[PDB]
């Protein structure tokens, strides 16, 4: 009966709220330099579905992570094309909001093509839009609009997420949908971005 999934919740309280609105919630555990095996281990126990979130990692950390942690969903968020491309080539499960901190979508037709080939999804996050000024919001939306176009054209896996860092960042599924609509998606497409597609991405962890 239509299951909705939040692919990127990064906070305890947020998780509690998300679980009340989404059938499934993936908790992303952020890491900068090293992947705390202990922390990550305890995370899976408390939540169940956990993703390793590499925040602007260096290629080595990416290769190393996908090398001995493939069993865990792997997310990469960075504003560096080099890392973005490499992360996609390495086969991470998703690239999250590459446009953040860039003056472009952080993706083109070449990278989009590479993502569909390497089974890598693009994550459209709401959070950057919540606390940014008017100028920033306008640009973020412009880039997200272009990213959507590329994703649609090349059939790249995609999902809408709050990428919540606090309970206050979380939004109801049908509201998250409106974000998709505003950036160019049809209602059916936005719905799939928080149900059908999340399902496909999580498939691998079978």
């Amino acid at each position: 009966g239509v299951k909705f999934i939040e692919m990127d919740i990064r906070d305890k309280e947020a998780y509690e709220l998300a679980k009340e609105w989404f059938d499934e919630v993936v908790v992303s555990i952020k890491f900068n330099e090293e992947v705390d095996k202990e922390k990550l281990r305890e995370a899976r126990k408390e939540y169940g579905k956990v993703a390793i979130l590499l925040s602007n990692p260096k290629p080595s950390l990416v290769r190393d992570t996908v090398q001995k942690f493939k069993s865990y969903l792997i997310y990469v968020e960075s504003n560096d094309l080099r890392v973005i491309r490499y992360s996609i080539e390495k086969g991470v499960d998703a690239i999250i909001s590459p446009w953040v901190n860039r003056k472009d979508p952080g993706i083109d037709h070449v990278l989009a093509k590479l993502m569909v080939k390497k089974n890598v999804a693009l994550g459209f996050s709401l959070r950057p839009l919540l606390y940014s000024n008017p100028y920033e919001r306008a640009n973020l939306l412009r880039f997200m609009m272009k990213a959507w176009k590329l994703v649609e054209k090349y059939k790249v896996r995609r999902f809408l997420t709050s990428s919540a860092q606090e309970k206050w960042d979380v939004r109801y599924p049908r509201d998250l949908i409106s974000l998709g609509v505003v950036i160019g998606m049809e209602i059916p497409q936005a719905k799939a971005s928080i149900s059908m597609y999340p399902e496909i991405i999580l498939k691998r962890l079978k």
Partner: protein, 119 residues
């Protein structure tokens, strides 16, 4: 005085109604809700987009923090977007959540707000 007359069933504005709930620790008055909705619309949709979407607070119940906001029939997702981008008002953090949408106020109440004691 002599207010204008309604308007033919083809020129008359077509509307949809949104039922919403405000999640927060602090309370809000009917006036604050009217103000925060106009404020977000003007920022997110601009003066032009606001004139197109025509956001209009029908009623807000401070007790349950639920309410009804009207919008042009064809731009409901844009108003839902403006509401979603709200994070705080008058120093109080909040989350606006849309409960449902309908073509009429009576139907909206029956399926989404009766539960909150609207009737």
């Amino acid at each position: 005085m002599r207010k204008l007359k309604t308007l033919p069933p083809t020129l008359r504005d077509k509307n949809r109604y949104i039922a919403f709930e405000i999640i927060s620790d602090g309370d809000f008055t009917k006036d604050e809700v009217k103000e925060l909705i106009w404020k977000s619309s003007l920022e997110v949709l601009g003066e032009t987009g606001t004139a197109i979407v025509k956001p209009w607070l029908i009623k807000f119940d401070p007790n349950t923090k639920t309410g009804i906001v009207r919008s042009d029939r064809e731009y409901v997702e844009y108003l839902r977007f403006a509401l979603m981008l709200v994070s705080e008002f008058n120093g109080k953090r909040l989350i606006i959540r849309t409960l449902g949408v309908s073509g009429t106020i009576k139907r909206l109440k029956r399926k989404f707000l009766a539960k909150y004691g609207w009737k």
